[PDB]
Design a protein around this motif. Structure first.
Motif: not given
Ligand SMILES: [Zn+2]
Ligand SMILES: [Zn+2]
Length: 595
Positions: A161-169, A198-201, A219-225
């Motif tokens: 993964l990378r912030v804001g990539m072209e991926i679906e849930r 919309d939250v995936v842990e 269809d883009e990842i926002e935040r990763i924590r």
């Protein structure tokens, strides 16, 4: 810019350490394949090696020969390198029993013994760390040479993964399932993932409390924590994050579909053979067992004891050298073999023991012949996997001496303590001799260790000593590991003056208060009376400024001459050192532990 080792030591190197660090650091830089660190007990071996590793900046494997020791190095290295990844790699074998069959008493020993969570979590952080950063040290049991799924597969199969990539849930939620992760919202534990709309842990297979959180906005990842599990307390803030497979045997679907058919073909070939030689009963067992397994693989891509099928899943030729934890390291890694005189024979034997145990299962029909391909390396295969190696031991074995350019000697202790003197005395009247010597130690407020060859002699001696008015404790050949500490701790306190046991090489027997070590039957035949074991035993008297050893024997064996000569050689050198530097040897004080 690289992640480098930062060694944290309240001390500086001392004695003949500085010289030894330099040779081994120079060796490794000149490019030597094999080096041997002959280091006396009581010098900082582990800290000398920690200096080697820190200065060369190489991913490093350090092999120990049992759970206890690996644990010691681990906790030690973790104190010396707290800002780097010190890892821990053991397996089932540590204290569990594998699959096996006894043809006389007709008993199938199942693999049953549940896969203990702590160890698994640990193998994963070890293998993931190897791909993530450089400053890694892995303390491992000889299990570092067992069958392990291919490193490229585990690598190539990561969800990168990378912030804001072209991926679906749901495209990601299927990707984690492909990698052996389960959905468990009703109970979040390691190796699980939780979907809350919309939250995936995701609970990395490598982590304790540190789970991951990926959220969407289209269809883009926002935040990763890095949230703390069952708390939500924000800790991390990464932009890139790699979630590694939850098993060391995962395979792409396409390879799996093809592996399965290879397994089917092997089953058919093996059934025909068995039924051709009249081993009908063996065909039935194998057929019931393999089909059930193949059914779990077709339904959900895995089964229990999938290890057995590793060569098939890897789609490699029959007879192939298994992949192991070694292949997971870079090409330019470093091996340190701790206590090499024992660790190398252990490694050397793993293959025959395992093959023996698996050949029985294949003969009786519990496994396919291909199961022999899921196994530890033979010593030769281990040999070819070596980039660069250092052997560490006070008594290097034949292999080490034979392949190293001489030895790098580390003999001087930081307090100037000397290897002991050694008297050898006759067996006749040995008990009264010994009684009177102990009496002297007791008057000077010193303790004694005594070793006899057999449990009966040990038991007789203890009595004979109690009758003499001397406080003595018997360290039974198999006593509660938690009671060991209690009796030993009590000898330090002087609740006991002497301590009798058979094997004095078992840890926790390095006691500053011990100034005398008596070796009964020094000349008898036994693993405990070899050149190596005697030196290891004499060393139990190297922690005290007045350390002395008494061997009782009728004869002077080759093992005795050697240990006596070596001990004489080490002492002279140590004396020469104290003379030059103005050191008076004195006993290293140590506080006593409790609960
Ligand atoms: Zn000096
Ligand atoms: Zn060789």
């Amino acid at each position: 810019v690289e992640g480098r080792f930062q060694l944290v030591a309240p001390y500086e190197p001392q004695g003949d350490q500085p010289q030894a660090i330099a040779k081994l650091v120079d060796g490794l830089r000149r490019g030597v394949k094999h080096q041997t660190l002959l280091g006396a007990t009581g010098t900082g071996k582990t800290f000398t090696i920690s200096n080697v590793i820190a200065q060369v900046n190489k991913p490093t494997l350090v092999i120990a020969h049992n759970k206890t020791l690996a644990g010691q190095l681990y906790s030690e290295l973790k104190e010396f390198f707290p800002h780097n990844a010190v890892e821990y790699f053991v397996s089932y074998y540590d204290y569990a029993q594998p699959e096996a069959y006894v043809p006389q008493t007709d008993t199938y020993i199942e693999k049953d013994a549940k896969i203990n969570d702590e160890i698994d979590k640990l193998r994963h952080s070890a293998t993931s760390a190897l791909f993530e950063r450089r400053d890694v040290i892995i303390v491992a049991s000889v299990s570092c040479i067992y069958g392990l799924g291919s490193p490229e597969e585990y690598r190539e199969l990561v969800v990168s993964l990378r912030v804001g990539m072209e991926i679906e849930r749901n495209a990601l939620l299927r990707r984690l399932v492909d990698i052996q992760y389960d959905r468990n919202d009703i109970d979040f534990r390691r190796g699980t993932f939780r979907v809350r709309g919309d939250v995936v842990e995701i609970f990395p297979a490598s982590r304790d409390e540190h789970c991951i959180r990926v959220e969407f906005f289209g269809d883009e990842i926002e935040r990763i924590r890095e949230v703390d599990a069952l708390t939500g307390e924000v800790l991390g803030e990464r932009e890139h994050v790699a979630i590694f497979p939850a098993s060391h045997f995962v395979t792409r679907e396409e390879k799996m579909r093809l592996a399965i058919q290879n397994i089917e073909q092997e089953l058919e070939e093996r059934l025909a053979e068995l039924r051709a030689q009249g081993k009908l009963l063996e065909a039935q067992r194998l057929e019931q067992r393999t089909r059930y397994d193949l059914e779990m693989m077709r339904e959900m891509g895995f089964c229990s004891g999938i290890e057995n099928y590793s060569r098939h899943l890897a789609l490699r030729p029959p007879g192939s050298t298994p992949y192991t934890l070694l292949d997971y390291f870079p090409d330019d890694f470093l091996i340190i073999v701790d206590e090499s005189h024992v660790t190398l024979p252990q490694l050397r034997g793993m293959y025959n023991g395992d093959r023996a145990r698996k050949q029985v299962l294949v003969d009786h029909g519990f496994r396919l012949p291909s199961a022999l391909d899921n196994r530890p390396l033979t010593f030769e295969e281990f040999e070819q996997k070596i980039n660069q190696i250092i052997y560490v031991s006070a008594t290097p074995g034949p292999y080490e001496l034979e392949h190293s350019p001489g030895v790098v000697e580390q003999i001087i202790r930081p307090t100037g303590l000397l290897d002991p003197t050694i008297d050898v005395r006759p067996t006749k009247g040995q008990i009264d001799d010994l009684i009177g010597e102990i009496r002297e130690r007791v008057e000077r407020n010193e303790r004694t260790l005594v070793t006899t060859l057999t449990k009966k002699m040990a038991e007789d001696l203890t009595d004979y000593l109690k009758e003499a008015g001397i406080k003595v404790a018997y360290l039974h050949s198999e006593i509660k590991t938690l009671e060991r500490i209690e009796i030993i701790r009590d000898l330090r306190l002087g609740k006991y003056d002497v301590l009798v046991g058979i094997n004095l090489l078992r840890e926790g027997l390095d006691i500053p208060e011990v100034s005398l070590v008596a070796i009964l039957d020094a000349d008898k035949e036994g693993f405990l009376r070899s050149e190596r074991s005697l030196i290891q035993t004499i060393g139990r008297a190297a922690r005290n400024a007045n350390g002395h050893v008494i061997m009782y024997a009728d004869t002077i064996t080759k093992s005795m001459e050697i240990a006596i000569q070596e001990t004489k050689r080490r002492r002279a050198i140590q004396e020469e050192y104290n003379r030059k530097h103005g050191i008076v040897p004195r006993t290293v004080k140590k506080e006593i532990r409790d609960v």
